[PDB]
């Protein structure tokens, strides 16, 4: 048998992590993440996870392959996935406003992907916590649902992006031996993503501009201390604009956000309870 | 791109194919899902650029591919058309020069694995045997199959025993593996297991070296004392209860080379693991033997 492995690289992202390319395999678009040597452990962790459980879910970025190739004086590490031409939710929210149906569809699809990660299924999958959930790690699909990407920090039962760190991460009180601690860190981050999306939902002719969480209280590339002072010491939370309280959908989403942001991690809603709440909105 | 041309091995591990890549033969190992933890471990080990060595099987690529619920696990290496030492020893006898070239090359590969470079961690193999040694056209061999390897760095005080329920080939297991008293958090324990197995491989090779117009037939270690397809408990009986070691044919004692090799084998087979020779000391001893 011939095994056609050639991928043509046709660049949609570049960072410290490495690069992401739009590629072609057998006439089909794929996404190719090429890891920097600095972030090899992210390739190893995602690969170890997919070797343990082949996740398949409409709201999880679809795995195609993990490739290690020997070079001259180095190892090349590629992760190949489904390609989502609309790009990340972070991207999408800058150039689009949302109606009620499109806002709910986005956030319920993210909750669905997250609840799938979190749930242990016997026979199935281990429970999984993401540990770096944010709008840049969510892709928009043509059908209006999203999918969650980047399991390089995931844990089965590098640090997370500081802007999205839960208070117990910033004050180093997280119970590191307790798997449920990691789910609760994801729920905090989910709540910040819900806030990012809800701002872009139009009501009564009003919308907020795209901003990242805590844009008004921390610098770009905020330090660990900058975040700890805001979230732990002062106990600040993202602003809920008055205009949301004229709209029943945004009023319900504001309540949901609040229940993801309790200082006490064990008070936070579960991903399954968030899904249920979202199915009863509208 | 790779063309799979012919199956050269098929068992519970999976299958190995001879394939073609850029005009060249390559070996393509397709793992069974039962052995997915070996695939991942081998991939971790081959990420070490300073692992590369004339007497370690050369890595080309490692892949995990999936669609729907079906996962394929591939390892692509150099291809050695002479096959494994296990295959070769059934087909040929050896002269002194060939016997020493083979066993020194295996010692050279094993010392390369065991010694930390400040780089490459120290590595213990845990499944050394004649089927896991490939014969090269230059008369040297290379060690294959790092799916059970343990890594250690003295420089950072880290030991990585991996997460693989696979155990070594039963016929080659040291007494402390068979009696399950091996100290699992001690890196030197795993090197000493490799030394026991190396001694067995030395014995397999030496039997095929002619002296005074005499050679022994190829036999695997403990062929005479265990059932075919021996169980863990079959091996524990002969190695641990019966304190059996491979017999040294008396014809070896006429030949200086085989007398030296019998001495080296015996120093790999002490019941006390800490009494066993190191891979470096074996390499140095074989460099001096003719
Ligand atoms: C190694 O590397 C890459 C391989 C591929 C790829 C290309 N064609 C065919 C395949 C294939 C899938 C599955 C089987 C089955 C069929 C028979 N069954 C009984 C067991 C095995 C065979 C072949 C693959 C896996 C794509 C790649 O990239 C997209 C690869 O590189 C990452
Ligand atoms: C988050 O993480 C990963 C994501 C992806 C991924 C999959 N589909 C599409 C993309 C994409 C395409 C295009 C744009 C646009 C954005 C606007 N403008 C700047 C031009 C380009 C952005 C994003 C990506 C980045 C793949 C990954 O691995 C292969 C990821 O890592 C796990
Ligand atoms: C990695 O990704 C892609 C792979 C492929 C692909 C190419 N050759 C063969 C296969 C295949 C055939 C048959 C089996 C099974 C069927 C049942 N039983 C008998 C065991 C064996 C598995 C696998 C596939 C899945 C195509 C893709 O897209 C068109 C892939 O996606 C980019
Ligand atoms: C041990 O382990 C691995 C080995 C290999 C590998 C590399 N060159 C040649 C071989 C070979 C070729 C042919 C025969 C013949 C011998 C006589 N008779 C029995 C018919 C068959 C045996 C052996 C192998 C098996 C590749 C691997 O990975 C790709 C290995 O796994 C790490």
XYZ file of C-alpha atoms and ligand atoms in Angstrom:
700
model
C 0.000 0.000 0.000
C 1.116 3.623 -0.696
C 0.904 5.886 2.427
C 0.580 9.482 1.115
C 2.101 11.559 3.980
C 3.101 14.685 1.972
C 1.372 17.838 3.342
C 1.784 21.075 1.329
C 2.128 24.061 3.735
C 0.195 26.898 2.004
C 0.961 30.686 7.906
C -2.167 31.614 9.975
C -0.419 32.043 13.364
C 3.086 32.588 14.801
C 4.057 32.882 18.499
C 6.501 31.600 21.152
C 4.641 28.163 20.857
C 5.719 27.899 17.190
C 3.561 28.373 14.059
C 0.202 27.218 12.620
C -0.157 26.700 8.846
C -3.045 26.049 6.547
C -1.961 22.901 4.686
C -3.343 20.580 2.031
C -3.505 16.770 2.213
C -5.222 14.798 -0.626
C -7.052 18.020 -1.699
C -8.424 18.616 1.894
C -7.424 21.586 4.115
C -5.629 20.642 7.345
C -4.101 22.810 10.084
C -0.410 22.073 10.916
C 1.034 23.258 14.222
C 4.855 23.248 14.122
C 6.219 23.359 17.704
C 9.224 25.401 18.850
C 11.856 23.343 20.790
C 10.812 25.631 23.765
C 7.272 24.114 23.750
C 8.040 20.421 22.928
C 6.275 19.345 26.182
C 2.938 20.685 24.731
C 3.321 18.317 21.714
C 4.210 15.390 24.056
C 1.244 16.036 26.389
C -1.343 16.368 23.580
C 0.147 13.254 21.879
C 0.107 11.235 25.177
C -3.558 12.258 25.705
C -4.657 11.241 22.157
C -2.678 7.959 22.504
C -4.746 7.322 25.719
C -8.167 8.390 24.353
C -9.050 9.331 20.784
C -11.358 12.275 21.591
C -14.106 12.756 18.998
C -16.603 15.548 19.633
C -18.141 18.269 17.425
C -16.884 20.954 19.873
C -13.274 19.639 20.214
C -10.777 20.506 17.454
C -10.538 17.335 15.385
C -7.275 15.367 15.673
C -5.702 13.988 12.472
C -2.049 13.217 13.351
C 0.996 13.723 15.602
C 4.286 13.556 13.658
C 7.884 13.481 14.876
C 10.549 13.702 12.107
C 14.341 13.343 12.616
C 16.460 16.233 11.206
C 20.236 16.793 10.898
C 20.659 18.230 14.452
C 17.020 18.448 15.708
C 13.574 16.822 15.977
C 10.561 18.415 14.157
C 7.198 18.087 15.987
C 3.908 18.638 14.090
C 0.289 18.347 15.255
C -2.191 18.035 12.354
C -5.877 18.850 12.892
C -9.052 19.852 11.100
C -8.843 23.382 9.617
C -11.450 26.061 10.537
C -11.165 28.841 7.956
C -13.132 31.371 10.114
C -10.253 31.307 12.619
C -10.336 31.789 16.387
C -13.220 33.232 18.435
C -10.780 36.017 19.498
C -10.309 36.895 15.761
C -14.030 36.552 14.941
C -15.312 38.770 17.787
C -13.141 41.708 16.577
C -14.870 41.939 13.147
C -18.420 40.713 13.948
C -21.385 41.508 16.207
C -23.816 38.765 17.297
C -27.571 38.324 17.558
C -29.228 36.333 20.388
C -29.266 33.003 18.458
C -25.579 33.322 17.328
C -24.404 34.344 20.851
C -26.187 31.409 22.536
C -25.006 28.960 19.833
C -21.359 29.987 20.397
C -21.440 29.767 24.191
C -23.516 26.559 24.396
C -21.127 24.882 21.868
C -18.135 25.862 24.065
C -19.938 24.558 27.228
C -20.682 21.310 25.322
C -17.007 20.816 24.362
C -15.891 21.642 27.897
C -18.426 19.281 29.580
C -17.205 16.517 27.198
C -13.598 17.130 28.314
C -14.591 17.214 32.013
C -16.753 14.015 32.106
C -15.339 10.551 32.836
C -17.061 7.892 30.656
C -16.498 4.205 31.712
C -15.632 1.440 29.121
C -15.112 5.879 27.180
C -12.576 8.474 28.390
C -10.808 9.780 31.478
C -11.947 13.160 32.822
C -9.796 15.950 31.301
C -9.144 19.522 32.410
C -7.922 21.952 29.696
C -5.964 24.432 31.889
C -5.581 27.139 29.153
C -9.135 27.979 28.010
C -9.408 31.408 26.336
C -10.902 32.926 23.172
C -7.653 32.343 21.150
C -7.983 28.556 21.965
C -11.530 28.356 20.524
C -12.178 28.101 16.770
C -15.348 29.189 14.899
C -16.940 26.646 12.541
C -19.004 27.518 9.452
C -22.154 26.091 11.159
C -21.901 28.736 13.931
C -20.720 26.354 16.648
C -17.179 26.538 18.081
C -14.585 23.950 19.019
C -11.984 23.930 21.785
C -8.291 23.669 20.787
C -4.859 23.156 22.419
C -4.607 20.272 24.917
C -0.875 20.892 25.489
C -1.499 21.793 29.186
C -4.401 19.329 29.662
C -4.499 16.872 32.576
C -6.238 13.479 32.608
C -7.882 11.797 35.685
C 4.259 26.091 30.395
C 1.561 27.592 32.690
C -1.864 28.903 31.776
C -2.383 32.357 30.208
C -2.076 34.770 33.170
C -5.026 37.032 32.170
C -7.365 34.003 32.489
C -5.887 32.477 35.720
C -8.368 31.728 38.543
C -7.739 33.308 41.962
C -6.519 29.994 43.516
C -3.844 29.753 40.748
C -2.700 33.348 41.340
C -2.575 32.960 45.191
C -1.104 29.393 44.922
C -3.889 27.902 47.187
C -5.101 25.530 44.436
C -5.305 21.931 45.803
C -2.876 20.509 43.171
C -3.566 16.827 44.234
C -7.354 17.201 43.611
C -8.542 16.735 39.987
C -11.764 18.773 40.552
C -9.515 21.816 41.279
C -8.503 21.836 37.574
C -12.123 21.669 36.357
C -12.909 24.694 38.571
C -9.983 26.636 37.010
C -11.504 25.909 33.583
C -14.945 27.163 34.733
C -13.410 30.504 35.826
C -11.807 30.875 32.358
C -15.106 29.842 30.686
C -16.859 32.651 32.541
C -14.315 35.211 31.133
C -14.932 33.821 27.613
C -18.729 34.120 28.161
C -18.142 37.817 29.093
C -16.012 38.371 25.939
C -18.779 36.962 23.718
C -21.756 38.594 25.477
C -20.222 42.077 24.991
C -20.513 41.520 21.205
C -24.259 40.587 21.328
C -26.432 43.535 20.121
C -29.442 44.614 22.215
C -31.612 47.729 21.653
C -29.058 48.935 19.029
C -26.148 48.858 21.526
C -22.989 46.698 21.551
C -19.663 46.864 23.403
C -16.346 46.903 21.497
C -14.283 43.700 21.694
C -12.029 43.779 24.778
C -10.098 41.059 26.558
C -10.982 40.286 30.194
C -9.544 42.873 32.663
C -8.560 45.241 29.769
C -9.416 48.192 32.056
C -7.336 47.163 35.114
C -4.128 45.389 33.890
C -1.569 46.097 31.182
C -0.977 44.117 27.995
C 0.962 40.959 28.953
C -0.029 41.465 32.576
C 2.337 40.055 35.201
C 1.405 37.330 37.667
C 1.447 40.042 40.414
C -0.691 42.401 38.319
C -3.330 39.674 38.037
C -3.044 38.569 41.698
C -3.680 42.149 42.917
C -6.812 42.496 40.727
C -8.360 39.050 41.172
C -7.193 37.951 44.672
C -6.422 41.053 46.731
C -9.052 43.522 45.381
C -11.407 40.692 44.199
C -12.369 42.599 40.992
C -14.521 40.908 38.332
C -15.330 42.028 34.778
C -17.909 44.890 34.464
C -21.528 44.017 33.559
C -22.846 47.006 31.529
C -26.248 48.475 32.469
C -27.585 47.862 28.928
C -27.412 44.062 29.531
C -30.210 44.387 32.184
C -32.697 45.537 29.459
C -32.155 42.241 27.543
C -33.406 38.912 29.013
C -30.624 36.862 27.295
C -27.799 39.142 28.556
C -29.419 39.313 32.054
C -29.352 35.466 32.198
C -25.752 35.342 30.826
C -24.607 37.923 33.457
C -25.998 35.646 36.227
C -24.220 32.647 34.668
C -20.868 34.563 34.464
C -21.178 35.537 38.164
C -21.625 31.842 39.091
C -18.342 30.967 37.261
C -16.389 33.687 39.217
C -16.898 32.815 42.901
C -13.670 33.216 44.935
C -14.474 29.777 46.480
C -13.760 27.323 43.613
C -16.225 24.691 44.950
C -19.155 27.282 44.655
C -18.651 27.563 40.867
C -21.157 25.958 38.458
C -20.176 22.721 36.672
C -19.918 22.605 32.877
C -23.018 20.325 32.820
C -25.012 22.845 34.921
C -23.867 25.684 32.549
C -25.128 23.664 29.535
C -28.509 23.105 31.197
C -28.833 26.820 32.070
C -27.927 27.802 28.448
C -30.557 25.388 27.005
C -33.291 27.137 29.097
C -32.236 30.680 27.929
C -34.627 31.920 25.152
C 5.520 9.250 1.074
C 6.156 5.545 1.891
C 5.292 2.335 -0.047
C 4.846 -0.798 2.156
C 6.426 -3.691 0.142
C 6.561 -6.789 2.393
C 5.894 -7.930 5.949
C 9.150 -9.049 7.682
C 7.564 -9.699 11.129
C 4.088 -10.091 12.697
C 3.231 -10.857 16.364
C 1.352 -9.418 19.404
C 3.619 -6.255 19.236
C 2.164 -5.474 15.788
C 3.937 -5.870 12.419
C 7.141 -4.698 10.753
C 7.204 -3.918 7.016
C 9.972 -3.316 4.564
C 8.933 -0.106 2.746
C 10.396 2.312 0.164
C 11.012 6.051 0.939
C 12.960 8.423 -1.418
C 14.354 5.347 -3.288
C 15.656 3.793 0.029
C 14.429 0.734 2.051
C 12.992 1.762 5.436
C 11.486 -0.341 8.253
C 7.907 0.581 9.225
C 6.661 -0.786 12.550
C 2.870 -0.702 12.967
C 2.005 -1.134 16.650
C -0.989 -3.075 17.990
C -3.325 -0.921 20.205
C -2.433 -3.429 22.960
C 1.124 -1.892 22.828
C 0.326 1.841 22.408
C 2.434 2.705 25.529
C 5.564 1.211 23.895
C 4.999 3.409 20.794
C 4.807 6.557 22.943
C 7.873 5.578 25.022
C 9.973 4.864 21.917
C 8.912 8.272 20.582
C 10.007 9.990 23.854
C 13.396 8.157 23.668
C 14.064 9.034 19.987
C 13.373 12.757 20.741
C 16.927 12.694 22.288
C 19.147 13.933 19.308
C 22.306 12.637 21.225
C 20.791 9.087 21.294
C 22.033 8.658 17.633
C 24.908 6.128 17.523
C 26.303 3.542 15.051
C 25.102 0.697 17.360
C 21.522 2.043 18.048
C 18.767 1.550 15.437
C 18.501 4.835 13.476
C 15.220 6.733 13.766
C 13.489 8.437 10.787
C 9.943 9.302 11.992
C 7.159 8.470 14.447
C 3.461 9.061 13.711
C 0.102 8.672 15.342
C -2.726 8.962 12.749
C -6.458 8.755 13.358
C -9.839 9.159 11.719
C -13.043 8.415 13.631
C -12.292 5.752 16.316
C -9.324 4.094 14.399
C -5.722 4.998 15.451
C -2.542 3.882 13.671
C 0.831 4.057 15.448
C 3.916 4.042 13.179
C 7.672 3.998 13.844
C 9.929 4.424 10.760
C 13.627 3.430 11.047
C 16.609 2.379 8.984
C 16.117 -1.100 7.425
C 18.733 -3.877 7.977
C 18.207 -6.550 5.288
C 20.342 -9.113 7.245
C 17.617 -9.099 9.897
C 18.149 -9.699 13.631
C 21.075 -11.405 15.351
C 18.568 -14.177 16.287
C 17.954 -14.771 12.546
C 21.650 -14.463 11.544
C 23.020 -16.893 14.185
C 20.775 -19.696 12.839
C 22.317 -19.335 9.336
C 26.055 -18.922 9.953
C 28.984 -19.795 12.133
C 31.489 -17.165 13.220
C 35.256 -16.851 13.260
C 37.040 -15.103 16.146
C 37.144 -11.688 14.421
C 33.409 -11.767 13.533
C 32.339 -13.027 16.977
C 34.319 -10.237 18.744
C 33.107 -7.558 16.258
C 29.464 -8.521 16.941
C 29.725 -8.615 20.744
C 31.907 -5.472 21.015
C 29.389 -3.568 18.832
C 26.520 -4.600 21.145
C 28.585 -3.589 24.209
C 29.362 -0.243 22.505
C 25.628 0.414 21.929
C 24.723 -0.642 25.474
C 27.446 1.553 27.041
C 26.176 4.439 24.867
C 22.658 3.865 26.251
C 23.755 3.484 29.894
C 26.141 6.494 30.055
C 24.680 10.000 30.669
C 26.083 12.857 28.422
C 25.810 16.295 30.162
C 22.900 15.836 25.868
C 21.427 12.392 26.710
C 20.056 10.965 29.928
C 21.369 7.570 31.120
C 19.048 4.938 29.521
C 18.345 1.323 30.509
C 16.788 -0.807 27.747
C 14.874 -3.515 29.804
C 14.257 -5.871 26.843
C 17.731 -6.718 25.437
C 17.678 -9.976 23.439
C 18.967 -11.308 20.108
C 15.675 -10.442 18.268
C 16.151 -6.777 19.380
C 19.659 -6.598 17.836
C 19.998 -6.001 14.073
C 22.965 -7.132 11.961
C 24.567 -4.550 9.649
C 26.572 -5.206 6.461
C 29.773 -3.858 8.188
C 29.592 -6.833 10.655
C 28.526 -4.669 13.581
C 25.092 -4.730 15.161
C 22.633 -2.137 16.424
C 20.235 -2.281 19.376
C 16.510 -1.784 18.697
C 13.215 -1.379 20.590
C 13.304 1.351 23.220
C 9.602 0.911 24.172
C 10.432 -0.300 27.726
C 13.400 2.085 28.334
C 13.960 3.926 31.672
C 15.744 7.328 31.676
C 17.802 8.872 34.506
C 19.716 12.134 34.954
C 22.149 12.310 37.906
C 22.718 15.996 36.974
C 19.014 16.841 37.915
C 18.244 13.797 40.140
C 15.342 12.679 37.913
C 14.195 9.098 37.155
C 11.566 8.471 34.446
C 10.333 4.813 34.547
C 7.461 5.630 32.153
C 3.929 4.167 32.267
C 4.119 0.845 30.367
C 2.685 -2.384 31.841
C 4.738 -4.349 29.264
C 7.449 -6.553 30.869
C 10.667 -7.905 29.377
C 10.974 -11.086 27.315
C 10.585 -13.855 29.908
C 13.567 -15.977 28.761
C 15.979 -13.043 29.327
C 14.622 -11.750 32.691
C 17.200 -11.418 35.519
C 16.572 -13.241 38.825
C 15.431 -9.979 40.583
C 12.885 -9.390 37.756
C 11.585 -12.996 37.981
C 11.349 -12.905 41.809
C 9.954 -9.305 41.633
C 12.418 -8.071 44.333
C 14.067 -5.561 41.901
C 14.309 -2.087 43.470
C 12.011 -0.168 41.059
C 13.063 3.366 42.182
C 16.814 2.610 41.669
C 18.132 3.420 38.142
C 21.202 1.143 38.622
C 18.752 -1.808 39.105
C 17.620 -1.430 35.463
C 21.202 -1.220 34.105
C 21.995 -4.480 35.993
C 18.961 -6.168 34.327
C 20.443 -5.164 30.921
C 23.826 -6.682 31.931
C 22.208 -10.058 32.794
C 20.479 -10.067 29.369
C 23.738 -9.017 27.621
C 25.448 -12.060 29.173
C 22.756 -14.275 27.693
C 23.255 -12.676 24.239
C 27.078 -13.161 24.615
C 26.411 -16.887 25.283
C 24.086 -17.152 22.214
C 26.785 -15.615 19.948
C 29.778 -17.516 21.426
C 28.067 -20.899 20.802
C 28.275 -20.069 17.061
C 32.018 -19.221 17.078
C 34.043 -22.164 15.671
C 37.040 -23.487 17.651
C 39.058 -26.592 16.809
C 36.442 -27.513 14.108
C 33.601 -27.607 16.747
C 30.570 -25.281 17.042
C 27.275 -25.571 18.980
C 23.874 -25.353 17.245
C 21.967 -22.081 17.744
C 19.828 -22.297 20.901
C 18.012 -19.597 22.892
C 18.952 -19.155 26.567
C 17.613 -21.929 28.847
C 16.416 -23.997 25.780
C 17.201 -27.261 27.648
C 15.527 -26.542 31.052
C 12.137 -24.835 30.328
C 9.079 -25.725 28.287
C 8.615 -24.279 24.796
C 7.047 -20.803 25.041
C 8.082 -20.571 28.737
C 5.883 -18.721 31.253
C 7.119 -16.187 33.836
C 6.833 -18.928 36.485
C 8.714 -21.442 34.247
C 11.642 -18.986 34.076
C 11.417 -18.130 37.798
C 11.727 -21.875 38.564
C 14.995 -22.387 36.659
C 16.664 -18.979 37.341
C 15.534 -18.335 40.922
C 14.602 -21.726 42.501
C 17.086 -23.958 40.583
C 19.832 -21.175 40.327
C 20.471 -22.321 36.711
C 22.785 -20.401 34.330
C 23.557 -21.307 30.707
C 26.082 -24.156 30.541
C 29.583 -23.385 29.209
C 30.500 -26.083 26.639
C 33.834 -27.618 27.768
C 35.261 -27.172 24.194
C 35.413 -23.371 24.915
C 38.187 -23.933 27.508
C 40.626 -24.989 24.671
C 40.225 -21.545 22.950
C 41.611 -18.367 24.619
C 38.865 -16.166 23.110
C 35.966 -18.343 24.265
C 37.654 -18.840 27.673
C 37.737 -14.985 28.032
C 34.100 -14.721 26.862
C 32.932 -17.445 29.337
C 34.606 -15.401 32.131
C 32.792 -12.236 30.950
C 29.390 -14.059 30.744
C 29.770 -15.372 34.293
C 30.445 -11.799 35.570
C 27.075 -10.766 33.978
C 25.205 -13.569 35.834
C 25.893 -12.958 39.550
C 22.695 -13.351 41.613
C 23.840 -10.159 43.423
C 23.002 -7.468 40.791
C 25.625 -5.039 42.231
C 28.396 -7.677 41.570
C 27.681 -7.619 37.787
C 30.116 -5.843 35.400
C 29.142 -2.443 33.934
C 28.566 -2.035 30.199
C 31.677 0.222 30.004
C 33.829 -2.482 31.681
C 32.449 -5.100 29.256
C 33.257 -2.787 26.309
C 36.824 -2.217 27.632
C 37.360 -5.981 28.226
C 36.126 -6.866 24.686
C 38.375 -4.119 23.179
C 41.392 -5.928 24.807
C 40.294 -9.579 23.949
C 41.407 -11.120 20.590
C 2.579 7.457 8.763
O 2.325 8.864 8.589
C 1.139 9.270 8.008
C 0.236 8.382 7.439
C -0.960 8.907 6.862
C -1.805 7.859 6.219
C -1.875 7.950 4.826
N -2.542 7.048 4.097
C -3.069 5.978 4.719
C -2.989 5.804 6.113
C -3.576 4.600 6.669
C -4.553 4.578 7.646
C -5.001 3.345 8.123
C -4.485 2.116 7.660
C -5.111 0.851 8.202
C -5.641 0.017 7.022
C -5.614 -1.501 7.296
N -5.997 -1.771 8.694
C -6.212 -3.224 8.887
C -4.972 -1.249 9.628
C -4.236 0.005 9.113
C -3.490 2.152 6.680
C -3.036 3.385 6.201
C -2.332 6.750 6.867
C -2.268 6.597 8.346
C -1.240 10.263 6.835
C -0.341 11.149 7.421
O -0.591 12.511 7.446
C -1.938 13.013 7.264
C 0.825 10.635 8.008
O 1.700 11.519 8.551
C 1.298 12.153 9.776
C -5.557 27.406 18.916
O -4.795 26.223 18.639
C -4.779 25.741 17.345
C -5.521 26.239 16.313
C -5.466 25.711 15.037
C -6.279 26.304 13.948
C -7.164 25.494 13.232
N -7.922 25.997 12.245
C -7.782 27.277 11.910
C -6.893 28.145 12.515
C -6.854 29.602 12.010
C -6.981 29.805 10.627
C -7.011 31.168 10.153
C -6.877 32.197 11.048
C -6.931 33.613 10.488
C -7.256 34.660 11.566
C -7.250 36.096 11.011
N -5.936 36.381 10.363
C -4.831 36.486 11.355
C -5.664 35.430 9.266
C -5.639 33.970 9.772
C -6.761 31.996 12.388
C -6.758 30.665 12.915
C -6.097 27.641 13.564
C -5.037 28.507 14.222
C -4.726 24.583 14.868
C -3.960 24.058 15.929
O -3.177 22.923 15.768
C -2.986 22.353 14.434
C -3.997 24.638 17.152
O -3.240 24.113 18.165
C -3.750 23.012 18.829
C -5.402 10.071 9.502
O -6.371 10.831 8.780
C -6.972 10.258 7.673
C -6.833 8.949 7.297
C -7.519 8.442 6.155
C -7.325 6.985 5.796
C -6.503 6.615 4.731
N -6.348 5.323 4.447
C -6.952 4.363 5.134
C -7.774 4.641 6.211
C -8.384 3.516 6.918
C -8.979 2.434 6.209
C -9.515 1.418 6.972
C -9.447 1.396 8.381
C -10.023 0.357 9.261
C -11.404 -0.084 8.789
C -11.989 -1.215 9.641
N -10.996 -2.272 9.978
C -10.744 -3.174 8.823
C -9.724 -1.728 10.501
C -9.075 -0.809 9.469
C -8.826 2.439 9.080
C -8.299 3.481 8.341
C -7.951 6.007 6.515
C -8.867 6.414 7.636
C -8.336 9.292 5.440
C -8.529 10.590 5.881
O -9.300 11.492 5.226
C -9.809 11.142 3.937
C -7.844 11.066 6.995
O -8.064 12.353 7.376
C -7.298 13.482 6.926
C 13.480 -5.206 16.728
O 12.775 -3.974 16.583
C 12.667 -3.446 15.314
C 13.278 -4.013 14.211
C 13.134 -3.416 12.952
C 13.808 -4.014 11.756
C 14.698 -3.229 11.037
N 15.384 -3.737 9.949
C 15.174 -5.067 9.653
C 14.308 -5.891 10.328
C 14.190 -7.315 9.871
C 14.155 -7.527 8.468
C 14.046 -8.855 8.000
C 13.997 -9.912 8.892
C 13.926 -11.271 8.241
C 14.886 -12.226 8.916
C 14.648 -13.713 8.612
N 13.254 -14.100 8.746
C 12.751 -13.928 10.135
C 12.477 -13.298 7.781
C 12.503 -11.796 8.218
C 14.090 -9.717 10.301
C 14.172 -8.407 10.774
C 13.579 -5.394 11.429
C 12.581 -6.255 12.172
C 12.406 -2.248 12.844
C 11.751 -1.737 13.964
O 10.994 -0.561 13.898
C 10.714 -0.003 12.610
C 11.907 -2.330 15.197
O 11.254 -1.836 16.310
C 11.914 -0.768 16.987
